[PDB]
Structures are given as structure tokens and as C-alpha cells.
């Protein structure tokens, strides 16, 4: 038993809710919140900009130190950093950004990072400003992640679509 509430069960291990991930994170305090990151951990907009704003920019400060030490992430890769006031940990995962021409097949590799964590609160990778089809992203998530994932979808219209078109 865990503290996530109001989710629709899609599969044995995947759940979905129409929710603002920032507000869900602040209420739940999950062990892991996933950020829709870029390779530079520049958290300017989308989910990343919202998560970072909710940390009063502490996520960005920590991220800049991480990059200065380690260099950029790989597309399809991830790193674990602090969850600040939002979660114990933030798993920064880089899905491919279609608006940069990155290979959508790397989306499966991106979701594989979730399997290193028993339970996660997460957005749909490569959705939103990353330019992928959220329905394809949901399919890859379901077919790749084996750990328990609670997907927060900000847009109510998108959500209802994702649910109604799910197979
Ligand atoms: C619009 C879109 C589907 C695609 C772009 C955003 C991104 O990928 O960064 C995420 N997003 C969400 O609806 C979403 N879902 C949960 N929490 C969120 N907080 C801010 C947006 C958001």
C-alpha cells in the first residue's frame, strides 16, 4: 500500500491521473519524482521548469554543479539528484526531443531508467514541449517499465484522450 490517490489503473504496474506533477509531488512526497530533463539539466520550461520553480531554483543550482563535474547526460540517460521539497529523490531522465530531431527509438532507453526504482511519480517522457506523441509515449512506458509508475498528466483533455485510446 502506498499514498497515491485518484489514479486509474492501466496495467499491473502503470497508473495514470490528471494532475499537476508539482502539486502531486508536494502532497505525496514520493521517494522518486521523474523530471523530463534535457542533457544539460537546464530546467527552463515544461515539466522541468515547473519542478525547478517549485524548488525555488535549488534544483537548477544542484544541476549546474552536477554538469560542471560530470558533463552532459546522454539522450536516453538519467541521473539521480535530490528531490528537494518535492520528493526524496529526483530522477532526471532525458527523453528524445523531437523538436531537436532526436531518434524516437531512444524513448524506450529513457523509460528503462525507471526500472531502477520500485515506485515513481512521473510525467510522460518526450511529451509536451519535447514534441512526441503522448499516446506513443504511453505505449512505450507500458511496454518498458516493470516497476510501479504513477503517471501525472497535466492537461485534462490529453488525459481523457490517453485513457479512452488506451489498449
Ligand atoms: C503538457 C505536457 C503533456 C507536455 C509538456 C510537459 C513536459 O513534457 O515537460 C508535460 N505535460 C503535462 O501535461 C504535465 N504533466 C504533469 N505535470 C506537468 N507540469 C507541467 C506540465 C505537466
From Swiss-Prot:
Catalysed transformations (reactions): Thiol-dependent hydrolysis of ester, thioester, amide, peptide and isopeptide bonds formed by the C-terminal Gly of ubiquitin (a 76-residue protein attached to proteins as an intracellular targeting signal)
Subcellular location: Host endoplasmic reticulum membrane
Documented activity regulation: Inhibited in vitro by GRL-0617.
Domain Macro intervals: 1-167
Membrane topology: Multi-pass membrane protein
Domain of life (superkingdom): Viruses
Assembly mode: May form homohexamers. Interacts with N protein.
Biological role stated in the UniProt entry: Responsible for the cleavages located at the N-terminus of the replicase polyprotein. Participates together with nsp4 in the assembly of virally-induced cytoplasmic double-membrane vesicles necessary for viral replication. Antagonizes innate immune induction of type I interferon by blocking the phosphorylation, dimerization and subsequent nuclear translocation of host IRF3. Also prevents host NF-kappa-B signaling. In addition, PL-PRO possesses a deubiquitinating/deISGylating activity and processes both 'Lys-48'- and 'Lys-63'-linked polyubiquitin chains from cellular substrates.
Protein known as: Papain-like protease nsp3
Source taxonomy: Viruses, Riboviria, Orthornavirae, Pisuviricota, Pisoniviricetes
Residues included from the entire protein: 1025 to 1191 of 7096
Amino acid at each position: 500500500v502506498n499514498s497515491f490517490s485518484g489514479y486509474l489503473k492501466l496495467t499491473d504496474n502503470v497508473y495514470i491521473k490528471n494532475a499537476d506533477i508539482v502539486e502531486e509531488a508536494k502532497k505525496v512526497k514520493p521517494t522518486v519524482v521523474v523530471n523530463a530533463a534535457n542533457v544539460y539539466l537546464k530546467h527552463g520550461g515544461g515539466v522541468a521548469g515547473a519542478l525547478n520553480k517549485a524548488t525555488n531554483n535549488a534544483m537548477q543550482v544542484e544541476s549546474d554543479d552536477y554538469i560542471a563535474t560530470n558533463g552532459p547526460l546522454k539522450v536516453g540517460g538519467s541521473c539521480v539528484l535530490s528531490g528537494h521539497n518535492l520528493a526524496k529523490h529526483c530522477l532526471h531522465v532525458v527523453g528524445p526531443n523531437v523538436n531537436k530531431g532526436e531518434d524516437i527509438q531512444l524513448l524506450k532507453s529513457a523509460y528503462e531508467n525507471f526500472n531502477q526504482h520500485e515506485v515513481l511519480l512521473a510525467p510522460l517522457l518526450s511529451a509536451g514541449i519535447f514534441g512526441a506523441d503522448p499516446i506513443h509515449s504511453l505505449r512505450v512506458c507500458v511496454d518498458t517499465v516493470r516497476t510501479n509508475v504513477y503517471l501525472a498528466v497535466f492537461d485534462k483533455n490529453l488525459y481523457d484522450k490517453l485513457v479512452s485510446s488506451f489498449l
